[PDB]
Amino acid sequence: ALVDEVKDMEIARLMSLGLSIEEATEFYENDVTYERYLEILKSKQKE
């Protein structure tokens, strides 16, 4: 899907894990889509 609503839903997924706003959106898309970045971020951020 290519609607702006996809971007916004995947961004709302960022808020559920705990992230920024506009930088969080760019990060989400540059890391992947959702579940793949969650796995990489859980590797990162110790303590």
Q: Where are the domains of the chain?
A: 1-47
N- to C-terminal Cα distance for the chain? 37
Burial of 32 (0-12, 13-18, 19+ CB in 10 A): middle
Q: Which CATH architecture has domain 1-47?
A: Orthogonal Bundle (1.10)
Burial of 23 (0-12, 13-18, 19+ CB in 10 A): exposed
Q: What's phi and psi for 33, nearest 5 deg?
A: -130, -40
The whole-angstrom separation of Cα 13 and Cα 47 is 22
Among 14, 46, 18, 47, which residue's Cα sits nearest to residue 30? Answer: 14
Structure method? NMR
| Neighbouring residues of 28: CB distance < 8 A, sequence distance ≥ 6 | 10, 11, 13, 14, 19, 34, 37
∠ CA 11-13-18, nearest 5°, is 95
